[PDB]
Structure formats: C-alpha cells, structure tokens
C-alpha cells in the first residue's frame, strides 16, 4: 500500500483580496516549503476575485509525518506577510487512509 502518499488538505482563509495577490500556506514539509513559500500552499479566487478574497484551496503534499504549518498571506503589493502569529501542525500519517484533512483559518 503506497499509492496514497500525498496529502490533500483543503485550506480556507477569510482575508479579502484585490484581483491580484495570493494568501499561502507555508508548512514545514519537503514539498510544503514552510520556509520558502515556493512550495507552501497558495490560495486563490476561482469564484471570488481573480486573485483570492476568500482565499480557498485544495493542494496535495507528498509526505506522511509531522509537518509544521505556518501561514503566509501574499498581498497584491508583492510582499508575503508570513502570518507567523498563529500556527498549525499537520501530522499526516503514512497510511492508506487519513491522508487528507482540513486546514481553515482567517486573517486578523
Ligand atoms: O528549506 C528548508 C529550510 O527552511 C528553514 O530555513 C529558513 C528558510 O530557508 C527561510 O525561508 C525562513 O523563512 C523565510 C521565508 O522564506 C520568508 O518569510 C522570508 O521573507 C522574505 C525575505 O525577502 C527573505 O527572507 C527571503 O527568504 C529567504 C529566501 O527565500 C532564500 O533564498 C534565502 O537565501 C538563502 C539564505 O541566505 C541561506 O541562509 C539559506 O539558508 C539555508 C539554511 O542554512 C538551512 O538550514 C535551511 O533551513 C531549513 C529549515 O528546515 C528551516 O529552518 O534553509 C536554507 C536551505 O539550506 O537559505 C537560502 C538558500 O538559498 O534568503 C531568505 C532568507 O531569509 O524571501 C522571503 C519571501 O520570498 O523570511 C523568512 C525568514 O524566516 O525560514 C528559515 C529561517 O527562519
Ligand atoms: O470588498 C469587495 C470585495 O469584492 C471586490 O471585487 C469583487 C467583485 O465582485 C469583482 O471585481 C470580482 O472580480 C472578478 C472575479 O474574477 C470574479 O468575482 C468574477 O465573477 C463574477 C461573475 O459575475 C459571477 O461569477 C458572479 O458570481 C459571484 C457572485 O456574484 C457573488 O455573490 C460572489 O460572492 C462572493 C464575492 O465574490 C465577494 O464578495 C467575496 O468576497 C467578499 C468578502 O467579504 C471579502 O473578500 C471582500 O472581497 C472584496 C474583493 O477583494 C474585491 O476584489 O468583500 C466581498 C464582499 O463584497 O465574497 C462573496 C461571498 O458570496 O460569489 C460568486 C463568486 O464566484 O459574480 C462574480 C463577482 O460579482 O467577477 C470579476 C470578473 O468577472 O470579484 C471581486 C472579488 O470579490
């Protein structure tokens, strides 16, 4: 059993946008570049604006262990305000199940 090795997690975040920007999910994982949004988890507006006013998301992480989950909110001024105030710890278990959960939050 090694087919399901990714982690589909749905994240959401109420922080409004401006048809141009991205609110991400940088969690500490090899594919979740928590410390380089280049591989965290961006959120956008498929229904909302073009950028992302409700900041929703559904990405997959190829891993199965403890992962840090810091959040970063990239604005339209090209500048990530790595929301590092709060914090999350997705312990994705390496099994045939329990490899996809939620990850909701919001901006203060
Ligand atoms: O990848 C695993 C790596 O993650 C952690 O280490 C640090 C991580 O690399 C940093 O990114 C940091 O989080 C930063 C985050 O990216 C942004 O919020 C950032 O703010 C912006 C700034 O404009 C600027 O900081 C920059 O961010 C970084 C660049 O993306 C990057 O190119 C870097 O340039 C190099 C560094 O000069 C060099 O020191 C190198 O460091 C390595 C470490 O020695 C190694 O331990 C490893 O650590 C792991 C570990 O799991 C976590 O601690 O990280 C490096 C890989 O070996 O990193 C670059 C190598 O090319 O310049 C800055 C660094 O500040 O751009 C962002 C927006 O784009 O600031 C955050 C600062 O925390 O998390 C940790 C350090 O806190
Ligand atoms: O502060 C105002 C708020 O909105 C600002 O601009 C919005 C404006 O509506 C447009 O500029 C649009 O931008 C484009 C984008 O590609 C799509 O939105 C697109 O689609 C339109 C179509 O006509 C159709 O899809 C239809 O469907 C929408 C509904 O009409 C509408 O009810 C919507 O509901 C959500 C809205 O998208 C928006 O209000 C959303 O955000 C609210 C939050 O309170 C907060 O984020 C903030 O957001 C700003 C935003 O950053 C600005 O850019 O206030 C919003 C409240 O006003 O939450 C609503 C919850 O129901 O649902 C569907 C979306 O699929 O209408 C849409 C838009 O009318 O239109 C444009 C190009 O076609 O969206 C931006 C982004 O909100």
- Tell me the domains of the chain and their CATH numbers: 1-108 (2.60.40.10)
Q: How far apart are CA 50 and CA 26, in angstroms?
A: 21
Ligand 1 site residues, Cβ closer than 6 angstroms: 33, 35-36, 80, 82
Structure obtained using: NMR
Ligand 1 midpoint to CA 103 (Å): 24
First to last CA, the chain: 42
| From 21, 35, 82, mutation site for ligand 1 pocket: most ligand atoms within 8 A of C-beta | 35
Residue 13 and residue 103 in contact, taking contact as beta carbons nearer than 8 Å: no
Widest CA span in the chain: 45
Q: What would the two tokens of residue 4 be? A: 């399901």
Number of H helices, E strands in the chain: 0, 8
Ligand 2 midpoint to CA 56 (Å): 13
Atom index in ligand 2 nearest the CA of residue 46 equals 65
Secondary structure (3-state) at 37 = helix
Distances (CA, A) of 14 to 45, 55, 57: 11, 6, 12
Q: How far apart are CA 51 and CA 47, in angstroms?
A: 10
Q: What are phi and psi of 38, to 5 degrees?
A: -50, -20
Atom index in ligand 1 nearest the CA of residue 80 equals 68
Q: How far apart are CA 78 and CA 69, in angstroms?
A: 21
Question: Which residue pairs from 39-45 have beta carbons closer than 8 angstroms and sit at least 24 positions apart in sequence?
Answer: 40/70, 40/72, 41/9, 41/11, 41/103, 42/74, 43/11, 43/12, 43/13, 45/17, 45/19
Residue 54 and residue 48 in contact, taking contact as beta carbons nearer than 8 Å: yes
């Amino acid at each position: 059993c090694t087919t399901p090795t990714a982690v589909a997690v749905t994240f959401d975040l109420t922080a409004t946008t401006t048809y141009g920007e991205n609110i991400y999910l940088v969690g500490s994982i090899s594919q979740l570049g928590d410390w380089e949004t280049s591989d965290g988890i961006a959120l956008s507006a498929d229904k909302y604006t073009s950028s992302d006013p409700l900041w929703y998301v559904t990405v997959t992480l190829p891993a199965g262990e403890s992962f840090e989950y810091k959040f970063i909110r990239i604005e339209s001024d090209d500048s990530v305000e790595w929301e590092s105030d709060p914090n999350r710890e997705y312990t994705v278990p390496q099994a045939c199940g329990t490899s996809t959960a939620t990850v909701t939050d919001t901006w203060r």
